[PDB]
Design a protein that fits this description.
part of a larger assembly; 3 chains; A mainly alpha; B mainly alpha; C mainly alpha; A: mainly alpha; 4 helices; 0% strand; B: mainly alpha; 4-stranded mixed sheet; 3-stranded antiparallel sheet; 20% helix; binds iron/sulfur cluster; binds FE3-S4 cluster; Fe-S-cluster-containing hydrogenase (chain B); 4Fe4S_Fe-S-bd (chain B)
Chain lengths: 156, 961, 99
């Protein structure tokens, strides 16, 4: 338990700022999606399919303050920062991942192809004798956008 | 103190496979004269579980009950270790020199076979390569339970042989006419199941649905998930269908069906079918004379449906008349004409009624040669008994039912020295050394490949893909103009019906030493480990027998049915569904087995008899009585003349359910399309939310601010991304009962014995409980319901709270995972749960497990020791290898990257399982559906597997009532 | 038996005590065999309907519980004194200072 809680309090802040910058991006995309696919799809559940995440993402912001303030209030318990940080990044990467799964379907209808830039798209585990996932994570990371997914569809 | 259990890796590394990770080989699975597709896991070249072939559109990735037990037939003990001659296990190397010298310089040699029905070109072509030399090869395909009887009825109807396919998605209304189209006993169980289920699958406040009209003679699983079922003795269903068509318009046909002019369920459906031309279907079961299947051709052609009863021309195979050959075989046995007798995969001493003798001929003839998997009653009586491979070591070829042309991948070397698969043995008869089936089989394809790419791009492609794509026979048109209309007066009566019928869990007894199947509840009645006779209470109360229980164990009377002086008795059980004067005695279960392993006694201080299910012998001994030899082989499913004698030896008969008929409780809540059209919010209306409070799921507890989902330590992992849940489209769920067996193999278990399950314990995690619902017992109309019930891995989860030894926890993603380590066995994990699904490893069944089955328990999950609970876990094992594979490389989990066993096996696509909070997946569509049936939600439990209700679809009036 | 107990001023008679005190207790072993189990089968499903057949080893443990009870109750009882002789002669007899 190296040096207390105050060390981790810098990186937990560095996560919440990524969320705050994504309030802009998600709500910005929520404008753009209404602009891009006005009538090119069902859009009646499928637009709200993107909004339903948004009320959760904003709800976690007020929480991420409450999560964090319960840590910075008393820096004498190491077994809350690793957990609050493990919760944030999961509650963060989830919402990043949930935005994507709803956003890849956008291309799936506008384009007849959900693109080959969709995911790592590696394969099953027995397809490691040919393709270790190491290759794949350097494909996915260096090709796939987290939330530049629909702005990418402004190029289409 | 612990042992030093070593590790013995490869020496000559096969390049493709790797140690820790399986890889999916794509085999087939023969039975009943056809070959279902299949897909194995093959952990390091050892098969552990079978799965479906998602590419093959006939199955689209599904596996009924009858396959997953065959996986254990592979790994049985007491199979065929030594080659037995005369009954002595003597030796093999002399047999090859023997049989080779018999074969090359033989000449005429007048041999006979009595094969399993071929359904394969290598077999049927090697037959010609065989028959080229030896003059007369009588070549009887001894169909299990006689001629299939769907086909012989149609060789005259269309003038040439043919098989049907029966889509059922392009077709709504289905008069079954005893047809167990949804029956694991019957063939094409998937395509009958799926596109029937899709008709039953709504996903809407109202849609056009099948509305079958089943008229069974014996209550069967197809009659359950059904509408307007009727009970009417077989041997008279022809008379039923007789007055049927006269109310449709094909012909007069009045005399056979004399007494059904104006019956409600006849005149009802007739107007409908003529009102549904491109949608109506007329099937026909197996308990009939073939004129019924002429009527299945006459009306179904006349009805206008041909693309809905997709019809396909076989390879000129009409000659399967059981009388014409099998008697004609032994008519040559008694004359000393036929010398050799080459059985392949069959027990005709067990089967093959005494009315047309077999054993009387078998002892007459030497040079008998039984290729065989077990050693039952035929090895013991023969002079040569080869051992046999299972299909997993055959290089066999095989046709799917009526369609494609698949091929087996053999996975494992022959587990036993000198197994000598039937095909190369049948070629060993062809006057050469044992043909390498790998090279033999290939030599046929070049004559019949039908693919412009050569083998090492096509062979590699078909052996990969599991199915030769373009095959599937050409489709015949209407041949019949009312030819087959002249075998009616076989509607004979005047006696108790003694009809036979094959349970979904066994098929002519050929898979009896099979615990996953043998300890498998039948869907009708959760019966295990004994053949039975099921009948009405009105005959029982007019005969004098009962299914009395004063200990919740169903003590049972007997029958001692007597046909032509060939009587045996058996337990009588009772069901409120069957009609007067009829009993459905199931086969198998009377198959004597001869053991090589010891009985494994241990001191009386130690328990072995209750645990060592493989101890007292092999399995198939004394589990019931043998019943096949009694019948008459003319229309060899039915029978008359059973001079019943209610005698003693009234012994137990054991079940899991032990009861039935909920007292008007909220556990199925059937509903009509009329009512469903009125109140889509009816899955909740039985126990709705409260006066002004929230909808039931996501209902707050006392706590909401300190709830762990609001605390980090449950929320902080690589898992919360994807909450897991598992709905059940109960509208297509009928007692296939394969929802179980894949759980048993994927997430390993032991079996349980009669002596043990009698006290009521069974280590089947997924109960498949059935229920009856009558109109307050109005006319004793059962109107069954089936519904699986895994551990709905709750949120509030009483069980989690209560393990003091923290062996339970709401793991992330709704998973409520058990650990088979931390528990201690105080069992109060189970007592809380409304659904008594926390099973418990009472005895140490695995310790007594032999050196044979141990191949089968898959090398990925924690087999469990005495004093430990266990439950569903949503087949967590394949969540882990997937989510782990997504932790390596950043990704989500696809809509179908993971498929559970209850999912991937249930051929009706009932279970879907896709992760909650992933809105594009099927679960969110199937949960957002109107009938999110939440079973016993009222206890404020908030569980996943928020499954669906059934919507039985009755008929508008049409003189129905 | 309790509402048949109070008759002759609580039934001071000693031999009735033994034949009653047993029978009062036998219902207790049923009270906990009833309350626990009679609602532990037939609980929220028909699927979980099963009678409880007790084995011949269930009963020898019950009996053995009487065995070890008497075995060890008698053991120390013969060593320690039965009656609370310290307070007996200190409470009701003339230990009171009013004499
Ligand atoms: S859900 Fe289970 S019982 Fe229903 S059809 Fe599928 S495997 Fe059979
Ligand atoms: S239903 Fe039973 S097994 Fe399932 S989560 Fe609830 S308490 Fe545990
Ligand atoms: S998830 Fe596995 S263990 Fe659970 S019921 Fe389904 S198949 Fe059986
Ligand atoms: S209550 Fe708990 S300790 Fe085990 S036996 Fe049951 S999970």
């Amino acid at each position: 338990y190296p040096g207390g809680v105050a060390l981790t309090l810098a990186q937990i802040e560095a996560a919440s700022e990524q969320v705050a910058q994504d309030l802009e991006q998600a709500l910005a995309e929520l404008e753009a999606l209404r602009l891009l696919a006005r009538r090119d799809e069902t859009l009646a559940p499928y637009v709200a399919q993107y909004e339903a995440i948004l009320e959760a993402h904003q709800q976690a912001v007020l929480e991420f303050e409450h999560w964090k303030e319960q840590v910075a209030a008393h820096p004498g318990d190491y077994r809350r920062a690793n957990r609050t940080l493990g919760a944030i990044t999961a509650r963060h990467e989830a919402l990043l991942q949930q935005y994507a799964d709803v956003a890849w379907a956008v291309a799936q209808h506008v384009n007849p192809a959900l693109l080959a830039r969709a995911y790592t798209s590696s394969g099953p585990r027995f397809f490691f004798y040919v393709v270790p996932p190491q290759y794949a994570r350097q494909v996915n990371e260096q090709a796939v956008p987290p939330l530049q997914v629909v702005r990418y569809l402004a190029a289409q | 103190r612990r042992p030093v259990e070593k590790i013995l890796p490869y020496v000559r590394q096969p390049e493709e496979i790797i140690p820790g990770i399986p890889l999916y080989y794509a085999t087939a699975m023969p039975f009943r004269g056809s070959v279902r597709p299949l897909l194995v896991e093959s952990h390091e070249g050892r098969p552990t579980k079978i799965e479906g072939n998602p590419d093959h559109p006939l199955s689209r990735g599904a596996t009924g009950v009858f396959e997953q037990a065959s996986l254990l037939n592979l790994y049985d003990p007491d199979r065929s270790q030594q080659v037995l001659r005369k009954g002595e296990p003597a030796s093999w190397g002399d047999f090859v020199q023997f049989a080779r010298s018999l074969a090359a310089e033989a000449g005429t040699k007048r041999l006979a076979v009595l094969c399993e029905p071929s359904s394969s070109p290598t077999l049927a072509a090697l037959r010609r390569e065989l028959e080229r030399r030896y003059a007369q090869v009588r070549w009887v395909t001894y169909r299990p339970e006689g001629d299939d009887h769907e086909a012989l009825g149609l060789q005259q109807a269309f003038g040439r042989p043919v098989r049907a396919r029966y889509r059922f998605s392009e077709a709504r209304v289905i008069v079954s006419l005893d047809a167990d189209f949804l029956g694991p006993t019957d063939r094409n169980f998937v395509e009958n199941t799926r596109e029937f289920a899709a008709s039953r699958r709504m996903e809407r406040p109202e849609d056009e649905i099948s509305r079958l009209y089943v008229i069974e003679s014996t209550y069967t699983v197809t009659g359950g998930m059904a509408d307007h079922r009727l009970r009417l003795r077989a041997g008279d269903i022809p008379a039923f269908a007789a007055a049927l068509a006269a109310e449709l318009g094909v012909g007069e046909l009045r005399e056979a069906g004399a007494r059904f002019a104006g019956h409600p369920y006849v005149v009802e459906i007739a107007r409908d079918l003529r009102a549904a031309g491109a949608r109506g279907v007329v099937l026909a079961g197996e308990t009939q004379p073939p004129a019924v299947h002429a009527l299945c051709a006459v009306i179904n052609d006349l009805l206008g449906s041909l693309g809905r009863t997709v019809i396909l021309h076989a390879l000129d195979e009409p000659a399967t008349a059981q009388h014409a050959a099998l008697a004609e075989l032994v008519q040559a046995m008694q004359a000393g004409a036929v010398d050799a007798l080459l059985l392949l995969n069959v027990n005709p001493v067990y089967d093959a009624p005494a009315a047309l003798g077999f054993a009387e001929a078998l002892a007459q003839v030497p040079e008998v040669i039984h290729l065989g998997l077990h050693v039952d009653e035929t090895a013991r009586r023969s002079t040569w008994h080869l051992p046999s491979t299972h299909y997993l070591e055959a290089w066999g070829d095989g046709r799917a039912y009526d369609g494609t042309l698949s091929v087996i991948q053999p996975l494992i070397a022959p587990l036993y020295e000198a197994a000598h698969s039937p095909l190369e043995v049948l070629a060993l008869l062809a006057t050469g050394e044992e043909q390498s089936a790998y090279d033999l089989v290939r030599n046929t394809w070049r004559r019949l490949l039908a693919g412009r790419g050569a083998f090492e791009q096509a062979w590699q492609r078909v052996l990969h893909d599991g199915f030769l794509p373009d095959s599937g026979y050409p489709t015949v048109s209407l041949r019949p103009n009312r030819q087959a209309l002249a075998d009616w007066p076989q509607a004979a009566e005047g006696g108790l019906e003694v009809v036979f019928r094959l349970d979904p869990t066994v098929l002519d007894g050929s898979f009896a030493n099979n615990a996953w199947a043998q300890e498998l509840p039948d869907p009708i009645t959760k019966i295990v480990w004994d053949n039975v006779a099921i009948l009405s209470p009105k005959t029982a109360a007019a005969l004098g027998v009962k299914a009395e229980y004063h200990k919740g164990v169903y003590i049972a009377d007997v029958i001692e049915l007597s046909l032509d002086g060939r009587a045996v008795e058996l337990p009588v059980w009772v069901l409120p569904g069957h009609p007067d004067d009829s009993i459905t005695v199931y086969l198998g279960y009377g198959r004597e087995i001869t053991s090589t392993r010891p009985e494994r006694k241990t001191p009386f201080f130690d328990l072995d008899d209750y645990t060592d299910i493989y101890g007292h012998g092999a399995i198939a001994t004394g589990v019931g009585v043998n019943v096949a030899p009694l019948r008459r082989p003319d229309n060899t499913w039915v029978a008359y003349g059973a001079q019943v004698r209610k005698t003693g030896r009234t012994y137990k008969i054991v079940t899991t359910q032990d009861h039935g008929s909920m007292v008007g409780r909220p556990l199925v809540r059937l509903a009509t399309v009329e009512e469903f059209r009125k109140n889509p919010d009816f899955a909740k209306e039985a126990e709705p939310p409260l006066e002004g409070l929230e909808p039931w799921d996501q209902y707050p507890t006392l706590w909401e601010e300190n709830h762990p989902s609001k605390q980090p330590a449950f929320q902080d992992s690589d898992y919360y991304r994807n909450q897991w849940a598992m709905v059940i489209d109960l509208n297509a769920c009928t007692g296939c009962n394969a929802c179980i067996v894949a759980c048993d193999s994927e997430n390993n278990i032991p079996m349980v014995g009669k002596n043990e399950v009698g006290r009521g314990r069974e280590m089947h995690w997924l109960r498949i409980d059935r229920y009856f619902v009558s109109d307050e017992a109005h006319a004793d109309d059962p109107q069954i319901v089936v519904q699986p019930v895994p551990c709905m891995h709750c949120e509030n989860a009483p069980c989690e709270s209560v393990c003091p030894v923290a062996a339970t926890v709401h793991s992330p993603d709704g998973l409520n995972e058990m650990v088979y380590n931390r528990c201690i066995g105080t069992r109060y994990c189970s007592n809380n749960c409304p659904y008594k699904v926390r099973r418990f490893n009472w005895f140490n069944w695995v310790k007594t497990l032999p050196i044979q089955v141990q191949m089968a328990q898959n090398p990925d999950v924690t087999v469990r020791f005495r004093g430990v609970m266990e439950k569903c876990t949503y087949c967590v094992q394949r969540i882990r290898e997937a989510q782990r594979q997504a932790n390596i490389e950043k990704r989500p989990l696809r809509d179908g990257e993971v498929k559970t066993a209850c999912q991937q096996a249930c051929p009706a696509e009932a279970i879907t399982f896709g992760d909650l909070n992933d809105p594009n997946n099927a679960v969110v569509k199937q949960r957002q559906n109107a009938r999110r049936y939440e079973m016993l939600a009222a206890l404020n439990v908030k569980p996943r597997t928020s499954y669906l209700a059934r919507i039985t679809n009755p008929n508008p009036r049409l003189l129905e009532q | 038996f309790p509402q048949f107990f109070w008759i002759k001023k609580l039934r001071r008679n000693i031999p009735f005590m033994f034949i009653a005190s047993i029978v009062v207790n036998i219902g207790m072993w049923f009270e906990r065999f009833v309350i626990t189990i009679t609602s532990l089968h037939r609980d929220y499903l028909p699927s979980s309907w099963d009678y409880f057949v007790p084995t011949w080893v269930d009963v020898l443990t019950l009996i053995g519980s009487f065995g070890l009870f008497f075995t060890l109750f008698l053991l120390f009882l013969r060593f320690v004194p039965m009656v609370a002789i310290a307070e007996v002669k200190g409470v009701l007899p003339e230990a009171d200072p009013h004499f």
